[PDB]
Structure formats: structure tokens, C-alpha cells
């Protein structure tokens, strides 16, 4: 494929997973805890977690479509006694790196989106433990909420980079929202979830509105940090998808040129 | 460079070394030993060895020009925290393979042309040892000629392939006019020179024209085999030069596409 319309006709459209990820980000952003505004109790807003499922499905599907297109291009290329022109293997190697990057990013984005989803899930569930008390107070069963948060921390997704992955490069690329082991195991830094957990009072806590709002503001600060981490990684994923499109345009042009000069 | 005129404007013109090699082949082909035709002694024709020098110089110059153009293209290409697009290194790798092939072929063609030259030289020098005897006979100082031939065999050029060279591939590419060691040392098979050497009578040999012509025909058969070996390798070199031109056209197109999509 040489144009964007050509790419879509070959079954690849990066706008699909990128928009579904954007929708998931908007869903996360929309989540709100209960509050008391000028004295009236306002129910929170919980997350429709299926938006996150839709994003995970689209990211998986896009990676499959990308791999399929590379496989077709590779087949096009492959395609004393004069041996096969070395440029053909060279381009196959470039294709192989492309396949690795597709897979890596799909795995990383799947895992991070599952994490993002699980944070949305806990921030929805925990609202059952915040309620109106008296005419001007809030009750927060914070011990129950700590347990919910710890359940998330305990089950954070891990991801395995492709064999041969340049670990130093991936550490730079992903940043410190994750850790990567020397064997390519990517784990999610639990620091924001820990800060959220440690902010909570015990069960049965009764707070005046002002103290509740101070806590909610701190909690939201951590929530917004997690949203920023995911926004950042979705932007990097979008750059990868742009790189893929450019790779295909390069390979298609190469194949065209080699066909004319054949 | 995207067109052939563009390549020549970038300092690369494969026609130059290829034509100088063709001229050397024609010079070799033109060599003829003395003879007696319908009773009259006909001087042989010796080789202008400078034609071979011109070819060696042109092959060296072409390889330099090719490397220089690749170096310029590489510079054009080179050119959390989002890391450099992997396609750039991939194309650099392809360039690196290109540089290796240029060097390898230059070394092989230089050495084989030196060999070819040295055979032309001995086939010229040896004519001093063939002369008219009587009205109908030829005298051949064949021992002196054996010594000249052995001097060539003893000083055949050797060539070293680039480090990392795929030895099995190069053995297939070059064929059995050469041998290649597991360490990439290319040596020239002396079999035709040995057959030429072993065809010769001793010093002072006096032959009737018919016996001389039988010997000359056998000698020429070996000479023509050596010409065919070199013609074959020059054709393979021409294919390499075509591959280089295609490589540049591919890389230029890639750089163009990546510039538009940047």
C-alpha cells in the first residue's frame, strides 16, 4: 500500500484502535466520586468498563492486520551461480523488526489498558463505600476500600517483550510508569495505587464535607496521574502506528522500484 | 539518486569499469601464438597489458564512488522518550551489507584481473621461445616456457573476503575457478595453467607444422577456458553493479517517502 486509503483497503486503519483508546481515556476521565456540593449529596459517576474491552479488542485486531500485511509484503519480496540479491534479505530483516515492534506494542498496550480498566473498576466499586451521613457529613468505609485497591495491586498484569528485545531502548521508550527486567518482563509501577491506598481512613470514618473534599482532591490527583501515564503511552502507541504506516509505504515503494528494475 | 542520469551525476557510472573489463577481455582474446600458415611464418600477437591496468584502476575507482554515495545516503538517514524510528537502523544495516558487497567484489575482481593480466603477460613473453626452424618446422624452447608458467602459478593473487562474509554463498557465487577457505581466503584454481605447463615439450624441440598446430590448439583451448572464467566473473560483477544501482534507487525512494511522512 502506498497511500492511507490503500492501507485501509489492505485492512489496516490505525484510527480504529486509537479512537477506542481515546474513548477509554474519556471514560476514565469521566469517573467521579460522590460529593456534597453546597450541601446536597451528589452521586458519583462509575465507569462503563466495556469501553476498555473495546479498546483492547481493537488493539489486538490492529496488530493482527498489521502482521498480515507485512506477511503479504514479505511474500511479494521472496518473491558459478548468481545468488539472490542481498537487498531482499535486508528488507525481510526490516520486516522482521516490524513484526517484533507490532507484537511488543500490542502486548504492552493490552496490559496497560487492562491495568487502566482495573483502576476504573476499583474506582467504581469503591463508591459503594462512600455515603451521606447526617445533613452535612460523609461516611467512608476506608478499610473496605483499601482491600479493593490492594486486590488491584496484587493482580497487576505483567507483559513479556519479544525475545531479542533491546531492553535499554524499551526502558527509555516506556518510561518509569513501568519497570522492565533484564529478561524483558514488564511490570506496572504500583506507586499511584499505593498512594491512593495509603490516603484512606479506616472503616466507619465520618468526615465533614471540607475534609472529605480534601481527601477526594488528593485521590483525584493520583487518579489523574494514572490517566496521564496512559495518555502518554497511547501517544507513543500512535507514533508506532505511524511508523508502521511509513514502513509499509517504504516497503511498497521498494517493491515497486525492484519490479521496474527486474 | 533515482535515475541512471542521477547516479552518474552522483559520480557513479558502472559502464566505465564494465567497459574497461570488456577491453581487457578483448585484449586477452586477441593474443595469438606464432604459426606457419600455408608455409609462411606468421608472428604472434602479444598483449598490451596496460588495458588490464586500466580495468583494475576503474574497478577500484567505481568501488570508491559507490561507497561514497552510500555514505552520503547513510548520513541523509541518520539524518518516557520516543526512540529513533527502527526503520532508520534497518536501512543502515542494508547499507552496511551494500558496503561489504562493494568491497568484496572489488577485491575479487582486482585479483582475478591481476591473474588474467599475468596470464596475458606470460602468453606474450613465451612467444620469444617459439621460432621458425628450417623451411617447414617450428622450434619451441618448452622448458623455458614451463618456467615462465610456473612463475605465474607461484605468484597467483589471493584475496580476503570482508569479515562476516557468508562463505557458502560466496563459494556458490564465484564457482570453481576459485577456492574459498573457511576464513574467507580466496585463491585461484591453477588447473588451466597446470594443463598449459604440462602440454609443453622440452627445450630445443623441433616440430613439423602439423604437430605444432596440434599443440597450439590444445594450448589455446586452456587459454580460452581462462577467458571464459573471467568473462563469467565479469558478468557476475555487472550483476552486482546493477544490484548497487537498484539499492541506491530503493534507498533514495525510502528517504523521499520518509521525508514526506516527516
Cβ(A173)–Cβ(B83) below 8 Å: yes
**In chain A, what are the domains?**
1-262 (1.20.1710.10)
CA distance A253 to chain B (A): 7
Resolution (A): 1.5
8 Å CB contact of A82 and B239 = yes
Question: What is the dihedral sign for C-alpha A220, A222, A227, A232?
Answer: positive
Cα(A174)–Cα(B179) distance, integer angstroms: 51
Cβ(A177)–Cβ(A188) below 8 Å: yes
Of the candidates A233, A239, A247, the beta carbon closest to that of B87 is on A247
Cα(B93)–Cα(A91) distance, integer angstroms: 10
Breaks (C-N over 2.5 A) in chain A follow: 79
Which residue in A has a C-alpha nearest to residue B92's C-alpha? A90
CA distance B238 to chain A (A): 11
Cβ(A66)–Cβ(A60) below 8 Å: no
> How many contacts does A have with B, using Cβ atoms within 8 A?
101
Cα(A20)–Cα(A11) distance, integer angstroms: 17
Cα(A113)–Cα(A231) distance, integer angstroms: 11
Cβ(A104)–Cβ(A163) below 8 Å: no
Of the candidates B243, B247, B254, the beta carbon closest to that of A253 is on B254
What is the grid cell recorded at A117?
A: 480498566
Cα(A229)–Cα(A108) distance, integer angstroms: 13
Method by which this entry was solved: X-ray
Q: Among B235, B254, B260, B262, pick the best mutation site for testing chain A contact (most A Cβ within 10 A).
A: B254
Radius of gyration of chain B (CA): 24
CA distance A250 to chain B (A): 5
Cβ(A15)–Cβ(A50) below 8 Å: no
Cα(B222)–Cα(A32) distance, integer angstroms: 92
Cα(B44)–Cα(B196) distance, integer angstroms: 17
User: How many CB atoms are located within 10 Å of the residue A164 CB?
Assistant: 9
How far CA B160 is from CA of A108, A224, B164, B182, in Å, comes to 46, 63, 11, 11
Counted residue by residue, chain B has a size of: 262
Q: Among B70, B73, B90, pick the best mutation site for testing chain A contact (most A Cβ within 10 A).
A: B90
8 Å CB contact of A90 and B97 = yes
Cα(A37)–Cα(A18) distance, integer angstroms: 36
Which residue in B has a C-alpha nearest to residue A247's C-alpha? B87
Cα(B28)–Cα(B120) distance, integer angstroms: 6
Of the candidates B239, B245, B257, the beta carbon closest to that of A250 is on B257
How far CA B234 is from CA of A117, B88, B121, in Å, comes to 65, 33, 20
8 Å CB contact of A86 and B250 = no
φ/ψ (deg, to 5) at A185: -85, 120
Among the listed residues B195, B126, B186, the one whose alpha carbon sits nearest the alpha carbon of residue B157? B186
Cα(A98)–Cα(A92) distance, integer angstroms: 10
How far CA B93 is from CA of B20, B99, B251, B259, in Å, comes to 31, 10, 12, 19
Among the listed residues B113, B97, B116, the one whose alpha carbon sits nearest the alpha carbon of residue B162? B97
Of the candidates A243, A247, A258, the beta carbon closest to that of B246 is on A258
What is the grid cell recorded at A53?
A: 474491552
3-state secondary structure chain B: CCCHHHHHHCCCCCHHHHHHHHHHHHHHHHCECCEEECCEEECCECCCCHHHHHHHHHHHHHHHHHHHHHHHHHHHHCCCCCCCCHHHHHHHHHHHHHHHHHHHHHHHHHHHHHHHHHHHHHHHHHHHHEEEECCCEEEECHHHHHHHHHHHHHCCCEEECCCCCCHHHHHHHHCCCEEECCCCEEEECCHHHHHHHHCCCCCCEEEEHHHHHHHHHHHHHHHHHHHHHHHHHHHHHHHHHHHHHHHHHHHHHHHHHHHHCC
Q: What residue has cell string 500485511?
A: A69
Of the CA atoms within 13 Å of residue B45, those in its CB half-sphere come to 8
What is the grid cell recorded at B214?
A: 596440434
Task: Name B131's bridge partners.
Answer: B139
Q: Among B86, B93, B176, B235, pick the best mutation site for testing chain A contact (most A Cβ within 10 A).
A: B86
CA A262 to chain centre: 44
How far CA A154 is from CA of A148, A187, A189, B6, B30, in Å, comes to 10, 12, 12, 63, 86
φ/ψ (deg, to 5) at B125: -55, -40
User: How many CB atoms are located within 10 Å of the residue A50 CB?
Assistant: 11
Cα(B128)–Cα(B130) distance, integer angstroms: 6
8 Å CB contact of A86 and B80 = no
Of the candidates B83, B94, B236, the beta carbon closest to that of A82 is on B236
Max CA separation in chain B (angstroms):
95
8 Å CB contact of A257 and B243 = no
Among the listed residues B101, B100, B151, B95, the one whose alpha carbon sits nearest the alpha carbon of residue B123? B151
Cα(A52)–Cα(A29) distance, integer angstroms: 13
Instruction: Output the CA angle B230-B236-B242, nearest 5 degrees.
Output: 140
Cβ(B186)–Cβ(B104) below 8 Å: no
Neighboring chain B residues of A85 at a CB cutoff of 8 Å? 243, 246
Residues 6+ apart with CB under 8 A from A214: none
Cβ(A68)–Cβ(A60) below 8 Å: no
CA distance B244 to chain A (A): 9
Task: Name A208's bridge partners.
Answer: A137
Counted residue by residue, chain A has a size of: 262
Among the listed residues B100, B125, B108, B117, the one whose alpha carbon sits nearest the alpha carbon of residue B188? B108
Among the listed residues B100, B111, B106, the one whose alpha carbon sits nearest the alpha carbon of residue B187? B111
What is the grid cell recorded at B103?
A: 568491497
3-state secondary structure chain A: CCCHHHHHHCCCCCHHHHHHHHHHHHHHHHCECCEEECCEEECCECCCCHHHHHHHHHHHHHHHHHHHHHHHHHHHHCCCCCCCCHHHHHHHHHHHHHHHHHHHHHHHHHHHHHHHHHHHHHHHHHHHHEEEECCCEEEECHHHHHHHHHHHHHCCCEEECCCCCCHHHHHHHHCCCEEECCCCEEEECCHHHHHHHHCCCCCCEEEEHHHHHHHHHHHHHHHHHHHHHHHHHHHHHHHHHHHHHHHHHHHHHHHHHHHHCC
For B105-137, give one letter per residue: b (16+ CB within 10 A) or e.
bbbbbbbbbbbbbbbbbbbbbbbebbeebeeeb
B163-169: long-range contacts, CB 8 A cutoff, minimum separation 24: B164/B100, B165/B100, B165/B104, B169/A83
8 Å CB contact of A87 and B250 = yes
Of the candidates A169, A247, A250, the beta carbon closest to that of B83 is on A169
Amino acid at each position: 500500500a502506498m497511500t492511507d486509503d490503500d492501507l485501509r483497503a489492505a485492512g489496516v486503519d490505525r484510527r480504529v484502535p486509537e479512537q477506542k483508546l481515546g474513548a477509554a481515556i474519556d471514560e476514565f476521565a469521566s469517573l467521579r466520586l460522590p460529593d456534597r456540593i453546597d450541601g446536597r449529596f451528589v452521586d458519583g459517576r462509575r465507569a462503563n468498563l466495556t469501553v476498555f474491552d473495546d479498546a483492547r479488542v481493537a488493539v489486538r485486531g490492529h496488530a493482527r492486520a498489521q502482521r498480515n500485511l507485512l506477511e503479504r509484503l514479505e511474500t511479494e519480496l521472496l518473491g558459478g551461480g548468481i545468488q539472490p540479491d542481498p537487498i531482499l534479505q535486508g528488507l525481510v530483516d526490516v520486516i522482521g523488526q516490524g513484526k517484533s515492534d507490532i507484537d511488543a506494542y500490542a502486548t504492552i498496550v493490552e496490559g496497560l489498558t487492562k491495568y487502566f480498566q482495573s483502576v476504573a473498576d476499583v474506582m467504581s466499586k469503591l463508591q459503594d463505600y462512600i455515603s451521606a451521613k447526617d445533613d452535612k457529613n460523609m461516611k467512608i468505609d476506608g478499610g473496605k476500600i483499601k482491600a479493593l485497591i490492594q486486590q488491584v495491586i496484587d493482580h497487576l498484569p505483567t507483559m513479556q517483550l519479544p525475545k531479542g528485545a533491546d531492553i535499554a531502548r524499551w526502558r527509555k521508550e516506556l518510561g518509569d510508569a513501568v519497570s522492565i527486567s533484564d529478561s524483558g518482563v514488564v511490570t506496572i509501577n504500583p506507586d499511584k495505587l499505593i498512594k491512593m491506598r495509603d490516603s484512606l481512613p479506616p472503616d466507619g470514618t465520618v468526615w465533614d464535607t471540607a475534609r472529605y473534599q480534601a481527601w477526594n482532591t488528593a485521590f483525584s490527583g493520583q487518579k489523574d496521574n494514572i490517566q496521564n501515564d496512559v495518555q502518554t503511552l497511547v501517544e507513543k502507541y500512535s507514533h508506532q502506528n505511524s511508523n508502521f504506516d511509513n514502513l509499509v509505504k517504504v516497503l511498497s515503494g521498494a517493491i515497486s522500484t525492484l519490479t521496474d528494475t527486474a
